[PDB]
Amino acid sequence: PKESDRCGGCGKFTHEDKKNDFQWIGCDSCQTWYHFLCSGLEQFEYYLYEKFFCPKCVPHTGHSIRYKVVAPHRYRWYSPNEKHLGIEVGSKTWIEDFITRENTVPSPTDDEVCIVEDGYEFRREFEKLGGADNWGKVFMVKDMDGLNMTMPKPGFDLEDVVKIMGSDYEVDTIDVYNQSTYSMKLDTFRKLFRDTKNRPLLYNFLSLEFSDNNEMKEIAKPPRFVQEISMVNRLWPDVSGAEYIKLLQREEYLPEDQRPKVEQFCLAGMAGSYTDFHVDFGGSSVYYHILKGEKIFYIAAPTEQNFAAYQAHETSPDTTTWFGDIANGAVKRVVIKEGQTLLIPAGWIHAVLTPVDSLVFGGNFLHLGNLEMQMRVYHLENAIRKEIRSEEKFYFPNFELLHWMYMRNVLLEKITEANQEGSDMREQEKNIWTASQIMKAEMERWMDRELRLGPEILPTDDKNKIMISVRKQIEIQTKIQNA
Amino acid sequence: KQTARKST
Amino acid sequence: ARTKQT
Ligand SMILES: O=C(O)CNC(=O)C(=O)O
Ligand SMILES: [Fe+2]
Ligand SMILES: [Zn+2]
Ligand SMILES: [Zn+2]
């Protein structure tokens, strides 16, 4: 080959390969080339520097020179060609302004959000409304006592987080003003977070999942009521011993690397951070506990009208219009403070402002009581994706497979056991029976689609073997009913 | 369009 | 910065 084209880092022409891709950056001083992963830059920096000085230079040349902030109202704040374009919703200019009028956004009705003082009052109100099987409104619980939600004692902060997870642990982080996600070392984030006075750019990570860290996973957990209704938790129980063995004896075992891991997240964001409107992936529900700081959520109920506005909003090229302004007064304001907890059921559209540096623990989960709404959000996502192109990692992992597994391992078993007696399921398991029908119908559609345009882990043949068995037991039970 | 969002 | 991919 040719020497000039050898990476001055790993000293090779081809990198070994988080993921380098096949990308290089050149030093503006010595002109040698480095693979991105060999340059000493982290992904969040790939676009910041107008002049890059490699580590070999930079004692004798100085730090890399970053682009000038030419257009604070654009995601491309560094591009002169955009100076004259419109103010974009995520931008620094936009957020400054939005901060001065955000408190005019109206408060919710009692139909939309129920505020309660503690988990005991939450429990009573939750039950008045039909519980999880009929969960439709958001709850804000001022004091976590009664929720059975394991959390770290105050005094716990970002410092303990980086110590437990490790300095080099990489988290996907939001570059607020750019409205994009890049990788950043936990140590790098902490450094920027500590420099309270100098913040050219704001960062906010939402995506630090720690259910696989043996220390962290005991320090912050979902409320008990959530662990009890979580579909993922039902399928990959964290059991041991004979429970686990039986889990193996039945073919109910599932690979740890197949598990959707979205139930234990830590979030940390700088004051002035803004996350724009979205519905959480798979239409999952959310528990959200503020350890430190403050959050302002802007929320809209999951109605067909709101979804149509939202779907249009997401597929439109436009970037200058705040969803709240085209949503016909649907958007409501709810402030959440330190120690307080938000519980959001499937489908709620929401954005969030971070008025103050914050540390949050939360998680996403699916449950039978919101099965219909979850499927409705799946359709919404699928429609949006037909338009714009997105990345898999912003969606619910193994969404479809989870349902095959849940139908096979959970619901089929229950309808079969019911069927083997006279048991009319409507007596002690009406909810199980209605969930089965809803899931079945949605799965029929998935089969039909697969037979039309082929597959994309579970062979087509296996799926078909599950469906026939489900149809059978379902028909058996409805005869037991018509009787 | 859809990059600034929760990642798994 | 000046970049390339291969
Ligand atoms: O905290 C943030 O700024 C955004 N997070 C959410 O939208 C949520 O947790 O469901
Ligand atoms: Fe969210
Ligand atoms: Zn290299
Ligand atoms: Zn150099």
CATH of the domain at A169: 2.60.120.650
User: Nearest ligand, CA of residue A40?
Assistant: 3
Per the CB < 8 Å rule, is B5 touching A394? yes
Our count of domains for chain A comes to 3
Cα separation, A140 vs A138, whole angstroms? 7
Query: CB of A280 closer than 6 A to ligand 1?
Result: yes
> Which residues in chain B (1-8) have CB-CB distances under 8 A to chain A?
1-8
In Å, how far is A126's CA from the nearest CA of chain B? 27
CATH number for the domain harbouring residue A52: 3.30.40.10
CATH number for the domain harbouring residue A409: 1.20.58.1360
Q: How many CB atoms lie within 10 A of CB A335?
A: 14
Residues A301 and A382 placed together within one structural domain of the fold? yes
End residue of a domain, out of A343, A367, A397: A397
Binding site annotation covers A278? yes
Per the CB < 8 Å rule, is C3 touching A51? no
Residues A298 and A163 placed together within one structural domain of the fold? yes
Residues A427 and A448 placed together within one structural domain of the fold? yes
> Which residues in chain A (420-439) have CB-CB distances under 8 A to chain C?
none
Say if CB A165 and CB A213 are below 8 A apart. yes
Q: What is the distance between the terminal CA atoms of chain C, rounded to a whole angstrom?
A: 17
- Using CB atoms within 10 A of its CB, is residue A80 exposed (0-12), middle (13-18) or buried (19+)? exposed
Resolution in A: 2.3
- Label the pairing between strands A203-209 and A265-269: antiparallel
Interface C:B, ≥3 CB–CB pairs < 8 Å: no
How far is the CA of A215 from the CAs of A147, A151, A175, A219, A437, in angstroms?
22, 13, 28, 7, 40
End residue of a domain, out of A36, A67, A98: A67
Residues A300 and A365 placed together within one structural domain of the fold? yes
**Which of helix, strand or coil describes residue A157?**
coil
Query: CB of A275 closer than 6 A to ligand 1?
Result: yes
Q: Report how far ligand 3's centroid is from the alpha carbon of A257 (Å).
A: 30
Q: Which domain holds residue A41?
A: 1-67
The phi, psi pair for A91, rounded to 5°, reads -65, 165
- Label the pairing between strands A285-300 and A332-337: antiparallel
Residues A274 and A148 placed together within one structural domain of the fold? yes
Cα separation, A116 vs A118, whole angstroms? 6
Residues A331 and A346 placed together within one structural domain of the fold? yes
A301 alpha carbon, distance to own chain's centre? 19
Query: CB of A352 closer than 6 A to ligand 1?
Result: yes
Q: Report how far ligand 3's centroid is from the alpha carbon of A50 (Å).
A: 21
How far is the CA of A39 from the CAs of A26, A53, A64, A231, A347, in angstroms?
9, 9, 12, 43, 42
**Which of helix, strand or coil describes residue A50?**
strand
Tokens of A446: 């998935």
Which protein residue's CA is at the shortest distance from atom 6 of ligand 1? Answer: A352
- Name the residue of chain A whose CA is nearest to C3's CA: A25
Find the angle CA(A399)-CA(A404)-CA(A407) to the nearest 5 degrees.
120
A-chain residues within 8 Å CB-CB of C5?
A: 21-24
Residues A356 and A403 placed together within one structural domain of the fold? no
Residues A377 and A324 placed together within one structural domain of the fold? yes
- Which structural technique was applied? X-ray
C-chain residues within 8 Å CB-CB of A12?
A: none
- Rounded to the nearest 10 degrees, how much is the dihedral formed by the CA atoms of A70, A73, A76, A82? -70
Query: CB of A206 closer than 6 A to ligand 1?
Result: yes
Binding site annotation covers A275? yes
Cα separation, A346 vs A91, whole angstroms? 28
B-chain residues within 8 Å CB-CB of A174?
A: 4-5
Nearest to A207 by CA among A183, A242, A235: A183
Facing A397 at nearest CB: one of B1, B2, B8: B8
User: Nearest ligand, CA of residue A268?
Assistant: 1
**Which of helix, strand or coil describes residue A207?**
strand
Cα separation, A31 vs A37, whole angstroms? 17
Residues composing chain C: 6
User: Nearest ligand, CA of residue A173?
Assistant: 1
Say if CB A135 and CB A228 are below 8 A apart. no
Query: CB of A288 closer than 6 A to ligand 1?
Result: yes
Cα separation, A119 vs A144, whole angstroms? 6
Nearest to A201 by CA among A48, A55, A429: A48
Residues A308 and A457 placed together within one structural domain of the fold? no
**Which of helix, strand or coil describes residue A383?**
helix
Query: CB of A262 closer than 6 A to ligand 1?
Result: no
The DSSP result for A106-153, as a single string, is PPPPTTTEEEEEEHHHHHHHHHHTTGGGG--SEEEEEE-TTS----PP
Residues A237 and A222 placed together within one structural domain of the fold? no
Sign of the four-CA dihedral A31, A33, A36, A42: negative
Residues A90 and A144 placed together within one structural domain of the fold? yes
Residues A298 and A381 placed together within one structural domain of the fold? yes
Q: What is the distance between the terminal CA atoms of chain A, rounded to a whole angstrom?
A: 80
- Counting from 1 in the atom list of ligand 1, the atom nearest the Cα of A275 is 3
